[PDB]
Structure 1
Amino acid sequence: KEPEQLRKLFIGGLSFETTDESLRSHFEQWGTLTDCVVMRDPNTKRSRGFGFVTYATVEEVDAAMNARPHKVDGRVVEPKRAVSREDSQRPGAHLTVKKIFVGGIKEDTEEHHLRDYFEQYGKIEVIEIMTDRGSGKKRGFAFVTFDDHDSVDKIVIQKYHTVNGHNCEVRKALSKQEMASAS
């Protein structure tokens, strides 16, 4: 049994008329659900427009995501890997992005180093190992862009990532303005 956090998905843009029952009925098609709930306003019961579903294994979760697009109760919803409450605290933890910031890589890191670790998560479209302007000096970080935002979500939810023989920190990429607006 893998952690509950990794066996759960956030479902956004849920129809006004979706209830635990209708949600379950749709997602059980891809595996055994251990949890399924529509979040409602703790007072008016009114649906908050989002919920979560949890499967018995992450294999079943992957199957659900490969099943995209998902339409529930006639509305196109948006399934996503569940970000933990703690990580949801971080700036832009819930954005839908295709690029990741990879920090703390050794100087001699080369593109094949990044590929041998990241390719297992999805199709890579771009790889950029950053250097200093005019100096040419390596800056110790890179940006990797995928073809599916889910490749990125599957990555960031993990804690460790080994590249060029050592662990590195990986986070969703924030734009120049998002960064500055986060500090």
Structure 2
Amino acid sequence: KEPEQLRKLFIGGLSFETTDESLRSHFEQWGTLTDCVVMRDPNTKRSRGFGFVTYATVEEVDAAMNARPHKVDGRVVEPKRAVSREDSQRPGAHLTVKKIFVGGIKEDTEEHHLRDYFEQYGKIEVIEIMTDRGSGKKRGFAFVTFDDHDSVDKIVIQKYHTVNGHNCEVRKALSKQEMASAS
């Protein structure tokens, strides 16, 4: 049994009339559910428009995601890897992005080092190892863009990532302005 957090999916954009039951009815098609819930207002009981489904295995979660687009109760919903309550406190943690910031890479890191590790997560579109403007010096970080936002979500939920022999920190890439609002 892998961690509950890794076996869970956040489902956004849920129809007003989707219930624990209708949601389970749909997603149970890709595996056993150990949990399924529609979030609603504690007072009006009105749907908050999102919920969670948890499978018995991550392989089942992966099958569900490979089955996009997902339509529930006549509405196209948006399944996403569930971000922990702790990580959800981080700026941009819930953004739908295709690019990741990879920090703390050795000076001799080359693109193939990034490919070797990250391709396991999806189709890479662009790799950018940053250097100082005019100095040529390596800055110790890079950006990797994928073709599926889920590749990014699958990556950032994990804690460790080994590139060029050592651990590196990986976060969703935020624009200069986004971080400024979070700085």
Aligned residues: 183
SS at match of 1:6: helix
Cα distance, 1:63 vs. partner? 0.2
- The CA distance in 1 between the partners of 2:70 and 2:107, in whole Å, is 43
Structure 1 unmatched runs, 5+: none
Cα distance, 1:42 vs. partner? 1.1
- The CA distance in 1 between the partners of 2:181 and 2:46, in whole Å, is 33
RMSD: 0.3
Encode CA deviations 1:43-69: one digit per residue, 9 max, x unaligned: 111100000000000000000000000
Cα distance, 1:181 vs. partner? 1.1
Cα distance, 1:180 vs. partner? 1.1
SS at match of 1:100: strand
How high is the TM-score relative to the length of structure 1?
1.00
- The CA distance in 2 between the partners of 1:156 and 1:132, in whole Å, is 26
SS at match of 1:105: coil
- The CA distance in 1 between the partners of 2:153 and 2:47, in whole Å, is 25
- The CA distance in 2 between the partners of 1:83 and 1:127, in whole Å, is 25
- The CA distance in 1 between the partners of 2:55 and 2:154, in whole Å, is 16
Asked if residue 37 in structure 1 is aligned to residue 37 in structure 2, the reply is yes
How high is the TM-score relative to the length of structure 2?
1.00
Cα distance, 1:107 vs. partner? 0.1
Cα distance, 1:89 vs. partner? 0.2
- The CA distance in 2 between the partners of 1:135 and 1:71, in whole Å, is 51
Asked if residue 159 in structure 1 is aligned to residue 159 in structure 2, the reply is yes
Displaced runs of 4 or more, over 4 A? none
Cα distance, 1:29 vs. partner? 0.3
Aligned to 1:125: 125
Cα distance, 1:14 vs. partner? 0.1
Encode CA deviations 1:76-113: one digit per residue, 9 max, x unaligned: 00000000000000001000000000000000000010
SS at match of 2:134: coil
Identity of aligned residues (%): 100
